[PDB]
Design a protein around this ligand. Structure first.
Ligand code: HEM
Ligand SMILES: c1ccc2[nH]cnc2c1
Length: 291
């Protein structure tokens, strides 16, 4: 399976910076969603789930085809709650009918991270929508009730190494788990929407307690109101993972640079870019534009 990137006809950087600004401006406007967390967290979760279906062995899945618009993927139990991100983007797609689905879902992810003051993420255009029979089957996304060995083996399918996996998991500093979507609950009081290296600092400094929640699932809870999934807590149980957790807890600039590389790689897996293709775009934030 080869997927060649194809620039939307006649478009250039100025066109995609307008779509970036439309997403960022609506993120500012609809600030009340999910008890004032806003839509930033669910949009980086959507971009990860539409990319996280990729399989390096036969190049099926991934962000290229925009197949989340089809029923089988939209109704995957693992994607419960992401309908809210899709409904957020649906007016922006109406406004810019020329951008492909895969490009709009991955650009929503990039825009959310930068507007929540995370690192710049270089982004490349050219994903092309493919037919409903190219939709991957359900069951390619990870379970949350497992250990370090499972996380490592799972991420090898997307060929992510240990360092890339620990950098990517730092996004669980954002937003919250919801009992009706996944069977995990919390945080609430201090759930957030600013991108920082706080997930690593919390993992190493909080006093964690293994408790059972209202859906009868176990999770790690702290006195301060924070929570961790079994798969999050895994990162301090494994010796390789723990030494990288300690490095990002002690250097937020190294965490930003490594997250940026790994998130762009996640969004680009499975796509072949021609050498006459444009360079990656670095979009300005609303703040850098004075908007
Ligand atoms: C083994 C890996 C992972 C597992 C098992 C996992 C699992 C989960 C679960 C169970 C939720 C809660 C969903 C809900 O109830 O609403 C969640 C939320 C979230 N995840 Fe992950 N995740 C993984 C990796 C990642 C990665 C790699 C990213 C991003 C690069 C990410 C970003 C997010 C974000 C931002 C949320 C919050 C969504 C919201 O606030 O609505 N996750 N994760
Ligand atoms: C999603 C959101 C917040 C989290 N804190 C720990 N794991 C999480 C997953």
């Amino acid at each position: 399976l080869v997927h060649v990137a194809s620039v939307e006809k006649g478009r250039s950087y100025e066109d995609f910076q307008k779509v970036y600004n439309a997403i960022a401006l609506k993120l500012r406007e609809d600030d009340e969603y999910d008890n004032y967390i806003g839509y930033g967290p669910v949009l980086v979760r959507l971009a990860w789930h539409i990319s996280g279906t990729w399989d390096k062995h036969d190049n099926t899945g991934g962000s290229y085809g925009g197949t989340y618009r089809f029923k089988k993927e939209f109704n995957d139990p693992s994607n419960a709650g992401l309908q809210n991100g899709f409904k957020f983007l649906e007016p922006i797609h109406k406004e810019f009918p020329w951008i492909s689905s895969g490009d709009l879902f991955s650009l929503g992810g990039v825009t959310a991270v930068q507007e929540m003051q995370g690192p710049k993420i270089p982004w490349r255009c050219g994903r092309v929508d493919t037919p409903e029979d190219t939709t991957p089957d359900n069951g390619r996304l990870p379970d949350a009730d497992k250990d370090a060995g499972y996380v490592r083996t799972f991420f090898q399918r997307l060929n992510m190494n240990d360092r890339e996996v620990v950098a990517l998991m730092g996004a669980h500093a954002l937003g919250k788990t919801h009992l009706k979507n996944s069977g995990y609950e919390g945080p609430g009081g201090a759930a957030n929407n600013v991108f920082t290296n706080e997930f690593y600092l919390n993992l190493l400094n909080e006093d964690w307690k293994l408790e059972k929640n209202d859906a009868n699932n176990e999770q790690w809870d702290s006195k301060s109101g924070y929570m961790m999934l079994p798969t999050d807590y895994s990162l301090i149980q494994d010796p390789k993972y723990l030494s990288i957790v300690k490095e990002y807890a002690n250097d937020q600039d190294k965490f930003f640079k490594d997250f940026s590389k790994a998130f762009e790689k996640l969004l680009e897996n499975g796509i072949t870019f021609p050498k006459d293709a444009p360079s990656p775009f670095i979009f300005k934030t609303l703040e850098e534009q004075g908007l």
